Each structure stands twice: as structure tokens, then as C-alpha cells.
Design goal:
part of a larger assembly; 2 chains; A: 37 residues; little secondary structure; 0% helix; globular; B: 49 residues; mainly alpha; 2 helices; 16% helix; Glutamate receptor ionotropic, NMDA 1 (chain B); Glutamate receptor ionotropic, NMDA 2B (chain A)
Chain lengths: 37, 49
């Protein structure tokens, strides 16, 4: 099944990082996430 | 007490050190390019960071 999970960047528990400048995707040991503006 | 309790220490403890595992910009560490050390860290996904 597919469902939407909120997340908030804080502490060791959630660390938000930018994608790789060359590849443009998330690296290993990481999962993608979104962000609005 | 002053002359025995003079321990600066604060020295890196191996590869499992939290400073190396979760590096900051202040702490800089490296190895020699294109050697066995490079293809040791590159091979292991747990050492990706």
C-alpha cells in the first residue's frame, strides 16, 4: 500500500540534506523526501 | 592534583569514532587518492558518509 508520511527535520532523528549536485538524486543510506514553499 | 590531572586527550578513537562517522565541517580528514584506502571506503555502503 501507499501512504503519505510527514516528517520534520530535527536532531539525529531527521536530518534533511540536499540532493547530489551531479546525480540529482538521493545518495545511499538515505531516502528521498519533498518540501514545499 | 594539578600535576597528575593534566590530561588533554580528546583524541580520535579508531574508525568508529562519532566525529568520523558523523563529520562536521570543522573536522577534516582524508586519505591518499586512488589507493587501497579509497576503494575500502567506497566498497562499503556503511562508510558512504
Amino acid at each position: 500500500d501507499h501512504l503519505s508520511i510527514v516528517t520534520l527535520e530535527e536532531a539525529p532523528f531527521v536530518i534533511v540534506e540536499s540532493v547530489d549536485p551531479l546525480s540529482g538524486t538521493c545518495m545511499r543510506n538515505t531516502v528521498p523526501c519533498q518540501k514545499r514553499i | 592534583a594539578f600535576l597528575v590531572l593534566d590530561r588533554p586527550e580528546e583524541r580520535i578513537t579508531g574508525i568508529n569514532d562519532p566525529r568520523l562517522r558523523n563529520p562536521s565541517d570543522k573536522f577534516i580528514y582524508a586519505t591518499v587518492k586512488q589507493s587501497s584506502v579509497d576503494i575500502y571506503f567506497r566498497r562499503q555502503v556503511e562508510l558512504s558518509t
